[PDB]
């Protein structure tokens, strides 16, 4: 039962979470508001559960009603350690909320709260991604080109950004995938490192 996973995660019943996750080893937790088990864990701050679920293969980029993903939830909590873990495991750094349209980095510190400095980490990635890791990057989603100069992506592809920048598109990275090259939306990428 999904409700079991949601609340044990929220409540921090790690033994329980571990028991029922197999009794729907297809969690697919969404809840009527869009909050999943991974949202609850990140929110209540249960690193071990956060670790377990992600490790289990829970989608790191689940978005709720207002577009909040677990990274948005980690950053609002100024949790750099959880942020470093999620990114490490596939967080969509550029996923934005739908209303104020902001990224996780922008969510850091409710207001003065529990010392930000988390922002720097996230802001670092948004700025070093595609260039660090020797320009390597990974596709968190598939991508069907609209325009001819766009690289076709697929769930999880490794590629090297042949630089990016302002000149032509801020939202679009110029990458080399396999042996081909083209435009890729930075919104579906992650370091995946």
């Amino acid at each position: 039962p999904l409700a079991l996973l949601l609340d044990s995660s929220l409540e921090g019943e790690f033994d329980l979470v571990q028991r029922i996750i197999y009794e729907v080893d297809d969690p697919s937790l969404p809840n009527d508001e869009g909050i999943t088990a991974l949202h609850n864990a990140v929110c209540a701050g249960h690193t071990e559960i956060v670790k377990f679920l992600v490790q289990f293969g829970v989608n790191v980029n689940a978005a709720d009603s207002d577009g909040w993903t677990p990274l948005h939830c980690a950053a609002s909590c100024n949790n750099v350690q959880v942020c470093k873990f999620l990114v490490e495991s596939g967080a969509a750094v550029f996923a934005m909320t739908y209303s104020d349209m902001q990224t996780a980095a922008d969510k850091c510190e409710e207001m003065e709260e529990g010392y930000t400095q988390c922002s720097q980490f996230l802001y670092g990635v948004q700025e070093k991604m595609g260039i660090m890791n020797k320009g390597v990057i990974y596709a968190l989603w598939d991508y069907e080109p609209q325009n001819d100069d766009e690289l076709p992506m697929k769930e999880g592809d490794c590629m090297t950004i042949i630089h990016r920048e302002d000149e032509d598109e801020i939202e679009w990275w110029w990458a080399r995938l396999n042996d081909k090259e083209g435009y890729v939306p930075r919104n579906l990428l992650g370091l995946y490192p």
């Binding site: 577009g67 934005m96 739908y98 209303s99 104020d100 609209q146 325009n147 302002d166 939202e171 679009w172």
Partner: protein
């Protein structure tokens, strides 16, 4: 697909644009060479209506966006998923509509029951006390790059003059590019 064929009609309808330049400070800038407007998402875009004889009372002015490339011309131009759902309503504009008219309490929006194409209309007002044209302030609510929306595909804006009954009196159009650096892009594209 909606027609983009110029029509001056019995009143001599044509469009005018401000002669701003390509300074990095410009918010909106039109290129005569390219018959293309370069503007910033949601800023004022003055579009002027030039006419030879004054249109009869009840005349209306309408605007609509269409994709420029033939391979995309049948896809209705609308805002991307995020923009469609962000909180930027002015309380008059439908959330999916790309083009808005600012500063006019008499603006009207349309979702075509049959074509599903969006458009905005406002009453025609003749030139001011000491003026030679009538200006309409537009706003474009998505960037040309908007993934999921225009997704880096060029579009055109079509302006049409129509009687109170909806009949065509005139039509004109121009290409549009919504970008962060209007002046820079115009210079580079003209280069």
């Amino acid at each position: 697909v909606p027609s983009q064929k110029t029509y001056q009609g019995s009143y001599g309808f044509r469009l005018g644009f401000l002669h701003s330049g390509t300074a990095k400070s410009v918010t909106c800038t039109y290129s005569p060479a390219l018959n293309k407007m370069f503007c910033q998402l949601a800023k004022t875009c003055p579009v002027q209506l030039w006419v030879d004889s004054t249109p009869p009372p009840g005349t209306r002015v309408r605007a609509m966006a269409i994709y420029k490339q033939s391979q995309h011309m049948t896809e209705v131009v609308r805002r991307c998923p995020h923009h469609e759902r962000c909180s930027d309503s002015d309380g008059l504009a439908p959330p999916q509509h790309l083009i808005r008219v600012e500063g006019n309490l008499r603006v009207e929006y349309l979702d075509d029951r049959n074509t599903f194409r969006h458009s905005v209309v406002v009453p025609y007002e003749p030139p001011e006390v000491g003026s030679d044209c009538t200006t309409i302030h537009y706003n474009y609510m998505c960037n040309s790059s908007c993934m999921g929306g225009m997704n880096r595909r060029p579009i055109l804006t079509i302006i049409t003059l129509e009687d109170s009954s909806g009949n065509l009196l005139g039509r004109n159009s121009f290409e549009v590019r919504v970008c962060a650096c209007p002046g820079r892009d115009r210079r580079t594209e003209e280069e």
